[PDB]
Amino acid sequence: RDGKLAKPRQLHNTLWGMVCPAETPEGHAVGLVKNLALMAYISVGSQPS
Amino acid sequence: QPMIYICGECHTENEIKSRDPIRCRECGYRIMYKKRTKRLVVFDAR
Amino acid sequence: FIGKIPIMLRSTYCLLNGLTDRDLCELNECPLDPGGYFIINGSEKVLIA
Amino acid sequence: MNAPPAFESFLLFEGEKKITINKDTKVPNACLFTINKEDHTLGNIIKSQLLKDPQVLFAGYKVPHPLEHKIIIRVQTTPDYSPQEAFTNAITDLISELSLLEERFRVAIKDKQEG
Amino acid sequence: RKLRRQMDIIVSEVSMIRDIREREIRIYTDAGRICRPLLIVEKQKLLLKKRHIDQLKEREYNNYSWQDLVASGVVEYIDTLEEETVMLAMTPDDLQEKEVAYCSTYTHCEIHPSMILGVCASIIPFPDHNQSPRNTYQSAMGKQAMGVYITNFHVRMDTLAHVLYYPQKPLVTTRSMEYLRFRELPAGINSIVAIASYTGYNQEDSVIMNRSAVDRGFFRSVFYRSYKEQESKGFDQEEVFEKPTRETCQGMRHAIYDKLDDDGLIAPGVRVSGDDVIIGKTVTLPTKRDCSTFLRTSETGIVDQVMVTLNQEGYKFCKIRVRSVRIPQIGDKFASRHGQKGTCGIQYRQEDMPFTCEGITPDIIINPHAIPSRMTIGHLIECLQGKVSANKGEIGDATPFNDAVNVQKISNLLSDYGYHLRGNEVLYNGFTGRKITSQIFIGPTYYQRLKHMVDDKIHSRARGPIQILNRQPMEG
Amino acid sequence: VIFNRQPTLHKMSMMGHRVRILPWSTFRLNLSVTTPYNADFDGDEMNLHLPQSLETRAEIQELAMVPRMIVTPQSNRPVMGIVQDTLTAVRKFTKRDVFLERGEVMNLLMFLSTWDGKVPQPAILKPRPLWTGKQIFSLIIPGHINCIRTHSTHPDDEDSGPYKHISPGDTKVVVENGELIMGILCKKSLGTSAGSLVHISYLEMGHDITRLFYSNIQTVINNWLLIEGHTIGIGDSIADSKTYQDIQNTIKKAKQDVIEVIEKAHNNELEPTPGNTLRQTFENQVNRILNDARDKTGSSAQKSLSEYNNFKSMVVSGAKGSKINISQVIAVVGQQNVEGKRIPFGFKHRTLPHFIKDDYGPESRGFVENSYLAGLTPTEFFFHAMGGREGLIDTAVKTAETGY
Amino acid sequence: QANQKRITTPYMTKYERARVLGTRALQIAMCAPVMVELEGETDPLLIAMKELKARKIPIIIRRYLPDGSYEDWGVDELIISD
Amino acid sequence: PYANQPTVRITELTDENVKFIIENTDLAVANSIRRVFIAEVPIIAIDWVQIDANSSVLHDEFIAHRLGLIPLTSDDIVDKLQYSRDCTCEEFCPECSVEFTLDVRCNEDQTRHVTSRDLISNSPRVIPVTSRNRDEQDDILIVKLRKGQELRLRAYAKKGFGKEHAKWNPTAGVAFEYDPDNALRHTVYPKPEEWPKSEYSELDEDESQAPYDPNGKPERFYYNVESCGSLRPETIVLSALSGLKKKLSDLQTQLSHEIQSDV
Amino acid sequence: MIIPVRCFTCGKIVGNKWEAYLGLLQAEYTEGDALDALGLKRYCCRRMLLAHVDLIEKLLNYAPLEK
Amino acid sequence: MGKRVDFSARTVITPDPNLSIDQVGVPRSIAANMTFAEIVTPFNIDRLQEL
RNA sequence: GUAACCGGAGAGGGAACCCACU
Ligand SMILES: [Mg+2]
Ligand SMILES: [Zn+2]
Ligand SMILES: [Zn+2]
Ligand SMILES: [Zn+2]
Fold it and tell me: In terms of CATH, what superfamily is F85-228?
């Protein structure tokens, strides 16, 4: 945190439909703490064999 | 002196003295709620 | 015996797994509670992704 | 915990005066009437009844602060006519208006009930 | 893709990605890949059909669930890697039709664009009619709006628990709230707001409240705080719950200990205040010294319930929860669903409050100077649709990208109920009775009460306690 | 007491005050004093220090009292100004067509602390006595102040042409011998600008007199606002539906121009601007076309704007909002920018998976042809969220450098 | 320095005005004899203000020059700003 | 320099509301009548709640608030009672208060609705508004009880007016309207054609608002006083008029005393 | 939790209208017909029942503290 | 350079147009906790005795 | 008009991390 590199904090184009664009804390964690979209699902992993 | 308590599970008023393990004489349940007090409560309707 | 692993609520080995709303109310649990958190020292803990 | 009691809006303390009269030194035949534990409900009608008197040169009210419970009525009248007597004539005319209104309203109710 | 769409060997979460200009073709199976479901589009037609919709509409009897829909090969889970190499359409009707051709080679379609929002941002009505920092602020303040946070809040002995007396589901809502269960555990009341400059007590982003409504229970809530304590720790320094007696125990506050029962606790239902003993605990002095827990200064609540039990060490353990209702006063922080926060500036009674041709006096008056720079046009549209809904009998629909409802349609619907089509009304001054020269914009809007009360922030000091290392005043 | 808002940036952040005891549990400070403190009353907390020794109490009284701190040494301007309802209501009150009844004039004059109890002769004696808003603001203005200001909507050609000293639009505020003769008072007259009416008042009369001037302005104007009224509504944001057609036509020709510029760039028919490469000159052409379109739609919006509009009633007074806020509300939100450029290609040579590859069109790179009334299509909503995220990040990041 | 060589301003600056008023009203608060006949006002700060306006404060100001020297300016002898 | 002569005619009389018109009076007088309607009409509502038992899921102060918002039928007793702050007695007597009792216990498996019918007054004429609704409608719900739950309380009803608390507000909706057609133009319509006609307006569909008259003064004040159920709508107006008249008389007495003490 | 006794804006009694409102909705009546069958002409009173969520039923599903 | 201080209060600010710019409204709870030390003198001795 | 019967005792660790407010 408290870093002057705003590039990680910015909303990336690949956040469409997987991370809420609006929802983020306004403090020193802008863009670093981001919630999850509604239908966004995180894969759980399986064997590739 | 009596300090009647309430079992969380079977809701049984059971006598407990000071410095005893928190135990219900039936059902062995270990969480107790105290009672409602006897002193007067006065509430304005505001 | 190796130890006791903290277990997440509403998980597949949690004691509230698959219980109906009437049973959850009988257990003084909220049927609307999504779960997904740990109870440790009687305090809800949520693993942030 | 700083909330004032609900009865503070209309109840006088011990030693308080319901009405206070202060002469206005800026202009002649002018007076400031400070009313405690009253509000627009009384101030507006008092001002309106005062404005009907042709011998009243100035009439208005204000509440200095809505959290406080006071209202200030400044009355300036023509010489040979006093602001105090102007205020009391306005009050005694408004009371007559209200009494006549009561009589007419109850008459209207009586004739509305099966009439 | 054929195997993944039938779940023969490749599971749905696995993503296959073909880079074309550069010859790599990558398959990912590891955990942590974030993905979302998308519809499958052939030549120019969806695989979702009237038969799918029908057999899934009659669910709970045909049990044709989302898993069966996935197995039908109708939807896929697409992560970012596979989202790079795919072509989506926002709406099948508007983006799959014969026209001046844009793509004509779609591969997937979105179920509904409103699903790009989160949880706190899915409760915003008309979020595409607001400036984005307003939406961010509303997503932040939705976590602070007080309401019934859980159904079993009375069995839940919890510190800092806030519940509202009369929560209401919003008159105007998104179709995404029924999935957040916001209409079952709402946080806020559908207030009738009048966006006007009445007296000046709302000038800088503040708000006037109706004192009579607050008396009637408007935004009234109760604050639950829980206190825990456990007895024990040494060879002879045994902790014990009891009433500390002055001749026996050495150290005591001026606080009155008669409120305690002889076991050392208060019975639930006893009025309590700051610097009042709640748990009488004493340690043996090698006569005795107390470690009694005092109620937090300036709390002034009432004990709700007292529980005694044993912790995992087998020692007596007590938790006590204290009720304290918080009547909305001036300075309490209120906010809408559009990032329009504000503290109450003054509370006028119903007589002092402006009113319509009827006796409708706004529960809330906010400064109109909060709209033009914030540009919360969603707030105005919510205030309009709320009146339309409360007059029609329907619950308003504020899906972000609905495109089936707009300001003109809402205005035409409102004009049928005897109101000005743009929501304005002719209010009368509450003090003088003269009708306000300008016409007031008024209507039901879903306001929220935030946890930031003023009684939890106000404090002073005059030579109080002092730190130990450097003799400066304490902090907190 | 001395009273500050904790992020103290200048000596107009710690200012003296006289304590008045009020019932409820909140600090209450006058609305002109909001500007120096940078307060917002949106949950702000301010902490109050009481000087204990009588020497330091007198020192605060003689140095840091707010009436003494009106004019900054930072930019030789007044810091407190009429703000946020009182400014708009003054603009509406000092208009030419503002007339007050006998009872209304008495009610307003009752809120003047610096009033001699002498009712001025009304601007109209027959058929029936009516006063004017300027006639009451002249009593509000203290002493004998002489200043000349210009209203926000003052036309440029008015000074050159005739009617120079008799303004058709009632602009060119002229205060003479402590009396408002003509002109509509706006931000540029009663605000924090240099040479404003309040600045002249502070420089001529005492700081206490200028304090009384704030108090009288705010009280009497807020009490006239009880009669006048000021709102904002969804009807204030609608157009004539001929302005909607004009805006749609402007957007459509702008889109056609962008498309044909893209065609010229693709057919290698576009010559790079000297001092720039092909990519940046194409970017410059696209930005010029989009900005011209946005400006034209905004100007059409203000032209369509009515006299009774509350958005205009706010922006002209300067209390809140700007002339581009109305354009973004009614006509066109605009083109979203991240780091000055259009929305970058986050995906493989495209912005979102809804756009075809290598799509440089206005809709594909952040331009929002919809306003805040018609709503934003989901692509435009995401682009606007991403654009506002940049400003939100900058707001947080800038503090740790500026305070240091 | 001697009375002939006084190079500082003859105007009583705002800091001198604040500190003289504070330190004189403090003396009035400690029951120092007032230099001006009062009309029943009880606040020592207003008493000190009245004394300053009447030019009767029994205090002189030592203005230290940067080189190390100083000048003794009597409150009655230099011009009050307000 | 004297009072004007107002006239009143009733346009609708009902147990729920009274709608009428007042002529030849001032805007300030009409507003003060409308204002006393809400603020200064004394009624009987319960202000002292003592809960002996509460096993419900709504807490004690919630129950007390919902109880206090319950209106009580006080048509003539409110005139003959006294404010508890003015009565010479101790805590409570029948001369300044009315005792209420509520003892409900749920024993069957069916959910028990605790309503205002379960409140037992000591005075038979001061009761909730479940008195008469024949010429089916429900009663005010207080709380719902599960099997085994109960609550026992004793309450007192004081005399108060709406300036203290909204529970002493005898009226629900006080419609106030003067000059329905904008003849005085106290309000200014940017587009008068878009505004719906008032109920009391007398204009054809062609005309949007009345022509302006500079000589006009506000008269013909239209009221629609809707009672909550405690007082009759017809007696709310009479009580408000009496209260305003006695308030003015008290102010006049204080002014006369002050003047005669100053002279 | 439970239906308020009075409308916050108007003050008209709404506490007795909830059960009748639910009964009317347990019929062909729509919300717009049930509200004015109960006599709610103002939208201030209409929203009181239209937007009310009745959480007391979910609260009663839990066993009480006593017996 | 900076440190905690006595005789200081903090709460939420709210607008109020009915008091001058030099006035600030403080609650009775804050005013009844923070104190100012007045030196007794024969002028204010009776007032301070009553206080 | 007694050996004041206790003398009003309040100072109440700290570090770490997290969330949040302006
Ligand atoms: Mg702020
Ligand atoms: Zn048991
Ligand atoms: Zn009695
Ligand atoms: Zn209502």
Answer: RNA polymerase Rpb1, domain 3 (1.10.274.100)
